Amino acid sequence: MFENITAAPADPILGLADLFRADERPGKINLGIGVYKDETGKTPVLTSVKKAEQYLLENETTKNYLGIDGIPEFGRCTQELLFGKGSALINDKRARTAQTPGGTGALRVAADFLAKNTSVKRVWVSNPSWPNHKSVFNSAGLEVREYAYYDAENHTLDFDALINSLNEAQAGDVVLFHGWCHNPTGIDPTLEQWQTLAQLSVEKGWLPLFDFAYQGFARGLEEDAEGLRAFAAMHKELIVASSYSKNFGLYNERVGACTLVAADSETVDRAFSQMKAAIRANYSNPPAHGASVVATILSNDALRAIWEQELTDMRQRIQRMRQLFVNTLQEKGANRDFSFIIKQNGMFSFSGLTKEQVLRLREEFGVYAVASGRVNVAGMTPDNMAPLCEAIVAVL
Amino acid sequence: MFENITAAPADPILGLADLFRADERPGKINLGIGVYKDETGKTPVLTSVKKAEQYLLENETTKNYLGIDGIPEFGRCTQELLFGKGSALINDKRARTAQTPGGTGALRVAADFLAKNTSVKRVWVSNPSWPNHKSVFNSAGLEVREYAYYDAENHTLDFDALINSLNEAQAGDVVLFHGWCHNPTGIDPTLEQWQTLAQLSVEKGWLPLFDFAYQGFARGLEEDAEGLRAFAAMHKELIVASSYSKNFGLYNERVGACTLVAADSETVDRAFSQMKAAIRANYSNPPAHGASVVATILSNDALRAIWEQELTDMRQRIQRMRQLFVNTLQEKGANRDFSFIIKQNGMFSFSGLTKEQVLRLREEFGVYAVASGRVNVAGMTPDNMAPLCEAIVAVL
Numbered sequence A, B: 001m002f003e004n005i006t007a008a009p010a011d012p013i014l015g016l017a018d019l020f021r022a023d024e025r026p027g028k029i030n031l032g033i034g035v036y037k038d039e040t041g042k043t044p045v046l047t048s049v050k051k052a053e054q055y056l057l058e059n060e061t062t063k064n065y066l067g068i069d070g071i072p073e074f075g076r077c078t079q080e081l082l083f084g085k086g087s088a089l090i091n092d093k094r095a096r097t098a099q100t101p102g103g104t105g106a107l108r109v110a111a112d113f114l115a116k117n118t119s120v121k122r123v124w125v126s127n128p129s130w131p132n133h134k135s136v137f138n139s140a141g142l143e144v145r146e147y148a149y150y151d152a153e154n155h156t157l158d159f160d161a162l163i164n165s166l167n168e169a170q171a172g173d174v175v176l177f178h179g180w181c182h183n184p185t186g187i188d189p190t191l192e193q194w195q196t197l198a199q200l201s202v203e204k205g206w207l208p209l210f211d212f213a214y215q216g217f218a219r220g221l222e223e224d225a226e227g228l229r230a231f232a233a234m235h236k237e238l239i240v241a242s243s244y245s246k247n248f249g250l251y252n253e254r255v256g257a258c259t260l261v262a263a264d265s266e267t268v269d270r271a272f273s274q275m276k277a278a279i280r281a282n283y284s285n286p287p288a289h290g291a292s293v294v295a296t297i298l299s300n301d302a303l304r305a306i307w308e309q310e311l312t313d314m315r316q317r318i319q320r321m322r323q324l325f326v327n328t329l330q331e332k333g334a335n336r337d338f339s340f341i342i343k344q345n346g347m348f349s350f351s352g353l354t355k356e357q358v359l360r361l362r363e364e365f366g367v368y369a370v371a372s373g374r375v376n377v378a379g380m381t382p383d384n385m386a387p388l389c390e391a392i393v394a395v396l
């Protein structure tokens, strides 16, 4: 039965992590996958997280199955983070959230749900976008169409191209928007731009789907949620696939959420019963550990104060590395002006390196970046900045 | 977009857990979902598990993403449990395993993989079988056909009906077999019967898919794996979706595995690259906590000795409850002879109660059983045995 199965191509992000592993070179540098590193080049378990974990170790009395949708408190805390504490969506009971295995799990559950319960056949994704978006949607059997976004020449969000590209989107299509800290460009719309978009979707009949994986990495928790909140106020319906992998440094515990919003309580509960059926036919119910760590921290004021500071430290450290990167490139003779990278948000900077330069960097210098030229600024430290900047100016 | 979504019907197993929750009756009894209970009617975290968890709390230094296929050691320990320590499959590198979110996750990954990479269009499941099998396979777009199994009249495995039913299965179809402790009947084939089946699949060209969720609940770890091992010796290809939810009491951490076996190392690695692609487009990578607990215990001799005894205690306690159940029914005037239940293996006994009796039990007496008449013997305790047996004889 398997004789003719052809090998799948390596994952552009995750397979990169393998090559780097197998690399016996001493000075190799990561920069590929979106995982935070501290000053020492390590990815430690957050202190608020370690504390919540002892708490769970001393307090859990059972590992009995959670319901299909997970821990209720987790769901509530998630909605408050997303929409705000006194949100009308929350007060009118217009939103239901299911705990899922990571943000990817949330996107797939959203896809399966839409493919099986609505008339959706098309999902619009930005050019460029997280490479795995296409795979997830194609998996549920939906086609992916792409909308213009990035202006490679000016390193700006080409807004008119974005709008004119979206005019080919029909009423009933799904349009995918990144929350804030666009992966891979780091270029995001202004609040004014988010409002224009919110009113155009409403007028055009698009169903917004937000992939929110970096809440807290641009300006703050509540600020980073402004685009989505702009949208939540206008729309009767929307879905949010959020992730706690990055903002809680909980990557491998698989903590995410799929939030479904409908015009009313009655409709959303009915639509949610089908979302639950899609989950049962997939992984049954979600993994408790990571999600209970998140609920514990968000529900406890002392633990929450510690986590918020840890997140602030991650954010600030990345901001410092960005400046450090553009300066060092300059003082190493990387003649090209890389100042636009200071203008990007989040863990990543879209460097503008070509497929071949990205390839040479690795084979000749052992510094690993995604083939699209996307580099993980959070993977940079004061110690690896110079060898890294030295490799870059040499392939330029 | 969601105005016309119709509510999904409640899950026959998981939705039962909700009704029981919402039940304000004092003497209500569970018996529905397949979760073990000790003498006190609680589902404690195993002692070996609590210990492995402190170990992880003191020793983990990162939550960085696992690879798509999970923790390597987890994969190795799994293959040894399944095939045996000195297995030829293991030595010839004919098997690859991916850590997945529970056994359900493993079945779905197997389904997606088969639907997208092979010519499979049909999956044969036993009548009766775990209610969720149909949903998982239909989700990947495969149809489910059913083979005869249970003889309701004699409470036996109707073996000729099983064989004659399977003669309608074509070369290239998938045939699903339960490892041991068949859910829901508890009726399993003899080793001789397993050999006859192994040779018939090989001759007929069926691809065996084993759902192994109760390893250790019938006679022992290695004995319960005899049917599958009978099959592994004859087949060039097979897939195993195993679960550690029940045997490790790790229900909510979602710990399972999907093991792919091909004729050789080269073929299995190629087929596995596609399995990994199906995982990436689903939940990306697996949850670390439960799986590392399992690897820690299986890799440590002291921790393993404790766990094996805990599992032995669960097994024995269930065996005692079974005897207790048939005796108490007898001394309460449940005139029907329920002795066949002593002959069933695992957590469940297929009681033979009708849809309406199962329904009356709940509404009039608050004892919850699955509508098929399946009852969780592991949910019985010396304290609830009498009220339970009293309710049963009253609806008889």
Ligand SMILES: *Cc1c(COP(=O)(O)O)cnc(C)c1O
Pocket: A034, A101, A102, A103, A104, A105, A130, A178, A183, A211, A213, A243, A244, A245, A251, A254, A255, A256, B283, B284
């Ligand atoms: C990291 C990321 C994901 C994946 O989240 P997981 O929680 O790791 O599944 C999805 N979308 C975007 C834009 C991401 O950056």
Ligand SMILES: *Cc1c(COP(=O)(O)O)cnc(C)c1O
Pocket: A283, A284, B034, B101, B102, B103, B104, B105, B130, B178, B183, B211, B213, B243, B244, B245, B251, B254, B255, B256
């Ligand atoms: C319990 C069970 C499952 C589900 O396993 P999870 O690990 O809970 O996903 C699948 N198949 C059978 C036969 C089961 O008994």
